[PDB]
Amino acid sequence: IYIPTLEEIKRTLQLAKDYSENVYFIYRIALESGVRLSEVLKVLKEPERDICGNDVCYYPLSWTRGYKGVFYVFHITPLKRVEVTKWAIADFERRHKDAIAIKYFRKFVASKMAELSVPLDIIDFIQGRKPARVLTQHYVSLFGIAKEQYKKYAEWLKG
């Protein structure tokens, strides 16, 4: 298993910014949140629903696949509307052969969150791998527990 280095992540962000401010921003929210590309595209299609606090922002997404559940896209940068072709990202990735593929940004987030002692199953929850079934104790508790761990990562991003 390979994991991107901070410098590969930064290089990619800088290339992304040159290519397009919107592609940069997709990458950036991928880096803040550790969610899948398709979930980042959903939150940026409708930034209205984003909730921000003193330290940290969150965007609830439903998940109705097998059971009905909820998870959150955590981040630190206020959202803005972004809609780009599906092809722009792929295009970006293809021209810069030193650019980290966006899907491997999650692996950087997990790795870094582990280094900051976020428990593995909160990492999974934060990343949207195991959404909380609605109206269960997990639903009651997980958001608040996740938010508190996410602050360690927010703190690190703010550098």
Swiss-Prot record:
The Tyr recombinase domain, residue ranges: 1-154
Catalytic machinery residues: 36, 106, 139
Lineage, opening ranks: Viruses, Viruses incertae sedis, Fuselloviridae, Alphafusellovirus
Protein name, UniProt field: Integrase
Task of the protein: This protein may encode a site-specific integrase, which is necessary for integration of the phage by site-specific recombination into a tRNA gene of the host chromosome. Essential for virus infection.
Domain of life from the UniProt record: Viruses
GO MF term list: DNA binding; hydrolase activity; transferase activity
Homology family: Belongs to the 'phage' integrase family.
Record keywords: DNA integration, DNA recombination, DNA-binding, Hydrolase, Transferase, Viral genome integration, Virus entry into host cell
GO biological processes: DNA integration; DNA recombination; establishment of integrated proviral latency; symbiont entry into host cell; viral genome integration into host DNA
Keyword Hydrolase listed: yes
